[PDB]
Design a protein around this ligand. Structure first.
Ligand SMILES: NC(=O)C1=CN([C@@H]2O[C@H](COP(=O)(O)OP(=O)(O)OC[C@H]3O[C@@H](n4cnc5c(N)ncnc54)[C@H](O)[C@@H]3O)[C@@H](O)[C@H]2O)C=CC1
Ligand SMILES: NC(=O)C1=CN([C@@H]2O[C@H](COP(=O)(O)OP(=O)(O)OC[C@H]3O[C@@H](n4cnc5c(N)ncnc54)[C@H](O)[C@@H]3O)[C@@H](O)[C@H]2O)C=CC1
Ligand SMILES: NC(=O)C1=CN([C@@H]2O[C@H](COP(=O)(O)OP(=O)(O)OC[C@H]3O[C@@H](n4cnc5c(N)ncnc54)[C@H](O)[C@@H]3O)[C@@H](O)[C@H]2O)C=CC1
Ligand SMILES: NC(=O)C1=CN([C@@H]2O[C@H](COP(=O)(O)OP(=O)(O)OC[C@H]3O[C@@H](n4cnc5c(N)ncnc54)[C@H](O)[C@@H]3O)[C@@H](O)[C@H]2O)C=CC1
Ligand SMILES: NC[C@H]1O[C@H](O[C@H]2[C@H](O)[C@@H](O[C@H]3O[C@H](CO)[C@@H](O)[C@H](O)[C@H]3O)[C@H](N)C[C@@H]2N)[C@H](N)[C@@H](O)[C@@H]1O
Ligand SMILES: NC[C@H]1O[C@H](O[C@H]2[C@H](O)[C@@H](O[C@H]3O[C@H](CO)[C@@H](O)[C@H](O)[C@H]3O)[C@H](N)C[C@@H]2N)[C@H](N)[C@@H](O)[C@@H]1O
Lengths: 342, 341, 342, 341
């Protein structure tokens, strides 16, 4: 049974602790947070073997097989490296690193230590996205894909740390674009990126970008748009569409649950908006890919099944994003090398 | 670990066999069918310990804890009774019985043998329906429920046995109305039915009803409509709405997956319609409540946890349907006793 | 140019006055209301030739060709009869009469005086409903219709007069069922009703019914449901569906405008709900059939074109409703004669 | 009464002829086409005073007040100029010109002859778009707009002339982008474009672009996307969304009619797709803005009311598109001057 430690007992510590507690092949062994009280609380909610106040002792404890890192972005690099050196397998929430060189360093490392390194690209394990991908891959029906667009918009992360560059490593392009890039590439069966073009906005007053458009040109001729926002009210939106020479496919995560409700007051267990017509969620964690993702990882560790979707994909997406940042700065379409296309 | 036998290796044998193979607390031990080849097919598909050609030997085998009965409706009664007598726990696909007295007999028989009897009201375990129910139960927001309507329509069951009365026990009202009634009652927290009114149609030519409307009046004042059809082209529809003094809630199972696709041809693993704009399914079996239902039953048998939604609910719905059949015959709104309002 | 008088300058006086003011073949000549100030206001809004304080003088004035009666239901009968006797053509808002015998009396009368009598079944002139009907009539595609359902729900009429039986003539079955029955019959090309079955509710506390289901059996085998409510929050709903042996057709009036908006506050020109996700309206009057309806009537009067959809249809629907009331009272399915089917 | 001539009796000649025949303040006086038979067809369909075989005689006839030009794009410039010189008011289908200089020339020429020149930006007169614009303009509710995206996709124009550069003047970016740009600018109350960035595709084989993305940066900080395609199967899509600091607004023209239908075959007067689930149209011409646009123009000519949306807006959009073509060539974000940001 894969013995698991959660590192950072906030929102995603919580989600991963739920999924782990429910997996018959794993045991939620430990929870650690800089804030010992948040660690104890989460340890009790999901019946963890214990709360570990010490990172040092955590890493030394040979009873742990795997660490799930759900701390702020800027910590991911250092914490994952220490972890892999200590001999633990590691699942890191996105973004795996804050730059391509950070990511590449972790990949090098995991391999040196013969450990599983996985990253939190949960959507790529969302069952409705898995289906979407099979439909685009049905060449008789869909023909050849030529457009893919992934939209990811919300009213922005609440946590204080997501507003500082050192702790967040970036604004909306990094926070949400990682997911969108990775979804475009994967929806097209790991398509090779030839060029990248991006423009960023700062919508909210005085700074990290809170909105972005990034466009990729792929080898096979197709074009990928990633449209990403921290400044969209009205409820999170996660949608994709793919268009081929014969077909079309659309995916809708948050308004594709087939539930609607209306109240004046607001329903007790419905996030936002509260009042009026809403689209309540059912099994949002599963729908979003977290159970399958973590299940894949538990399986990789439990018995050396390499990962369907590996950290090389995180390197690729990191390069895209870094090239996007630079495309914006220079107002130009760019190769991943960084050089202008012309 | 709960050792399981599937009886009837057709479409729902297939579904239950999938759910059982995937449950860590159970083992798919056997598959049996009148057609030994269909049983072997399914046994291999889901890695069943074995294919049992013999009903007799199936029921005698003390390695089996639980039977799932997925045969034609007319057989359910007889098969479930023999099964409970043989000492096995049993989950029967709907409709549990073909009449209220058949259903009552099974419930009481299960009790005699101290067995868990469950029935296949899978939608009552559908996670999106469970969530719809919580929202209607949120009184501050929803207020008091006064209308519930469940719609269940398809182009009708293809199997020959579903067209004959003896093997099917009834037409669309029994086939689909069982689900719809049971959902109206449950969405309103086991609401008491005071009257029943129904009209049936024969749309497709020379006979079992193809289409029906059944309406219930509940104790609290609310009205429930069940609108049910074997003659709707264009893709199955499963749908509910509940309306209160303050709120509204709507549930859409098959066109509420958040997936759409278009092709001229038709996509490989997408049902009907094939061509043009479709609404592909993801995790249909889960979404429909089968995993949670069978899970509930596995749990009841395995670690003696009583069933959340028991077979008395099948008796209640059976009475509603039998009163609906009679309402139609007499052109009158009726009490469950059978007497006219 | 057809010279028009509006009688009752409230909400529907307002709508009809707009449509009339915009019709090149008519002239908004006069507005009359028991409340002379409401008449003057509406006369000014839509540039009416004058405000007429006297019903007597209104009816005697030979400059008026047509009267549009937008007063409370209970007045329709008497006002339309006086009008037709005075020699005026008449368009009466629904329900044309409060009972079948009232309606039959008006039909008799209009014919005696060789006048056009029309009733406010506007939806039957809604362009999206006209299309729906053509699609069901396309027998190759649709086959034979076997189900039609029309749903009509709102949070109920606000006017004081709609709560008293003498002034309203009935509750939700009469107010909304008239529209629904008439839509079912017309969507099926004037289908003959064989039986009627209905059950009514009183949802709001202490009385007129505020919710109803009525079901019709038609000659050709099809079944019609009319589901009608004064107790549905969240915005008016007007939907229909028709199902045949080959086809299906769905119509959505209020959430089929293809406009959506979100705000916290509420948009200035959007009715209800105010806040959160709404479905704003564009050209609601036209979409609802009022321009076409009134246009048909203006044409019938302007040049004796008999009406596509005549007051005989109002008699038929009145009989259905009266039979529905009785079906409810007796708990039985009934023939229009009133006799039980068995 | 405004006496009107239609030039080019194909699809849009047909549409404009319908709108004109129905306007009480105008008279459909003439129809002309290179193909005299197509002109006669259309003249009879909409009861035109006559079919004019001769362009020369058409322009000389002093009974005509206004010409509507619905010929292939390459002809617009020449035909509109001859028309304005002949003393006629003119409405030209998009794209008004094939380049900014062509457009500028016409505007100035119209002025010399004191004529109304309008262009076919019909969607800017679409009642549901007019309403979308009012909601974005409601500052308390919407806040400040920061994103606008207009999507315009179809399976591409069937006419041969639209595949050749000389007759079409451009591919999808010019054909559909003109509409999309003009809608982004107008939905934001005539927002000033500061930069333009675009990438084009050739999806269908050996050439004019089939597909494009064009992005504008506006003065106020907002960003506009125009996503345009000749290679999308499954039915035309026209769609916009605008996102502010507080609100959101979404507009859907072709799948926002509130009509759906299913058949195995296909419904008589329903376009593409034919079979399976479709979204039948009602009043498409009105919904698309043609009646209000032509009404505006009839009014301008008839009773000297200036145009709400004038041809300067066609110049602005033409500059955006020409800068987009150049952006694509150079792989760079560009100012309208042509210079790199
Ligand atoms: N895939 C997805 O959908 C999502 C991913 N995330 C990602 O998950 C990660 C965590 O996100 P959340 O929203 O933040 O949870 P958060 O802000 O709720 O929690 C952070 C937790 O980590 C603790 N912490 C901070 N620094 C620490 C350190 N150096 N050592 C140990 N513990 C420390 C804090 O006390 C806190 O309990 C982020 O990388 C974010 O990108 C977040 C939300 C959704
Ligand atoms: N939960 C749900 O939504 C649904 C439930 N059902 C129910 O599932 C049950 C089975 O339906 P399907 O699998 O659709 O039909 P099916 O025809 O697809 O399968 C029936 C199987 O039982 C076999 N069989 C017949 N006589 C037998 C006997 N005497 N002993 C053993 N096996 C025999 C048949 O050859 C066939 O293999 C029915 O009661 C139906 O009411 C069906 C569809 C959906
Ligand atoms: N087809 C449709 O969608 C609709 C139809 N209606 C119908 O229109 C009619 C009027 O409805 P509204 O909502 O009421 O407007 P309302 O209540 O706003 O106005 C009634 C007006 O008539 C005046 N009035 C009352 N009695 C009068 C009399 N005896 N003589 C002259 N004037 C008198 C009042 O002072 C008032 O101005 C009703 O029959 C109602 O069913 C109403 C709303 C929508
Ligand atoms: N507002 C909108 O959304 C749309 C606008 N259009 C525009 O409408 C215009 C016409 O397009 P369609 O009618 O689709 O093409 P079409 O091919 O359907 O019609 C063009 C007509 O002009 C005729 N013609 C060719 N050379 C001629 C000449 N020298 N003199 C007179 N007539 C001649 C052709 O034979 C044909 O009858 C195009 O500029 C296109 O940009 C087209 C589709 C939609
Ligand atoms: N308002 C709903 C919800 O907003 C936050 O949580 C949401 C998360 O923020 C949201 O994560 C998205 O947004 C995060 C913030 O931009 C991204 O870092 C992340 O990659 C993305 O998936 C996730 N997919 C849905 C989840 N429900 C917030 N953490 C949660 O407590 C609150 O209840
Ligand atoms: N909340 C929107 C609106 O509600 C009332 O007006 C609605 C009308 O009540 C509504 O009429 C429906 O409801 C009326 C009340 O039940 C029925 O008598 C009528 O036959 C039906 O069409 C109409 N189709 C739509 C119209 N917008 C109300 N008169 C109006 O002022 C208010 O602005």
């Amino acid at each position: 049974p894969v013995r698991v430690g959660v590192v950072g007992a906030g929102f995603m510590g919580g989600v991963h602790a739920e999924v782990v507690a429910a997996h018959p092949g794993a045991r939620l062994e430990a929870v650690h947070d800089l804030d010992p009280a948040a660690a104890r609380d989460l340890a009790e909610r999901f019946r963890a073997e214990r709360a570990e106040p010490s990172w040092a002792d955590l890493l030394a404890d040979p009873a742990i097989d795997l660490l799930i890192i759900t701390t702020p972005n800027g910590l991911h690099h250092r914490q994952a490296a220490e972890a892999l050196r200590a001999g633990k397998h590691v699942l890191v929430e996105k973004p795996l690193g804050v730059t391509p060189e950070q990511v590449a360093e972790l990949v090098e490392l995991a391999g040196r230590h013969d450990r599983v390194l996985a990253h939190g690209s949960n959507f790529v394990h969302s069952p409705k996205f898995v289906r979407a991908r099979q439909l685009v891959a049905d060449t008789e029906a869909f023909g050849r894909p030529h457009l893919v667009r992934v939209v990811f918009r919300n009213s922005g992360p609440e946590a204080a740390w997501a507003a500082s560059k050192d702790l967040a490593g970036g604004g909306a392009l990094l926070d949400l674009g990682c997911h969108a890039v990775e979804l475009c590439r994967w929806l097209l069966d790991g398509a090779d990126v030839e060029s990248v073009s991006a423009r960023l906005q700062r919508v909210r007053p005085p700074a990290l970008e809170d909105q972005a458009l990034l466009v990729m040109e792929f080898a096979d001729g197709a074009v990928g748009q990633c449209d990403v926002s921290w400044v969209t009210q009205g409820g999170e939106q996660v949608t994709a569409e793919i268009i081929g020479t014969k077909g079309r496919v659309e995916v809708d995560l948050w308004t594709g649950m087939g539930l609607r409700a209306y109240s004046d007051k607001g329903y007790q267990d419905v996030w936002d908006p509260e009042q009026g017509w809403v689209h309540p969620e059912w099994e949002w964690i599963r729908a979003s890919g977290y159970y399958h993702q973590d299940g894949t990882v538990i399986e990789a560790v439990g018995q050396g099944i390499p990962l369907t979707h590996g950290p090389a994909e995180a390197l690729a997406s990191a390069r895209v994003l870094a090239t996007g940042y630079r495309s914006h700065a220079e107002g130009r379409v760019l190769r991943l090398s960084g050089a202008p296309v012309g």
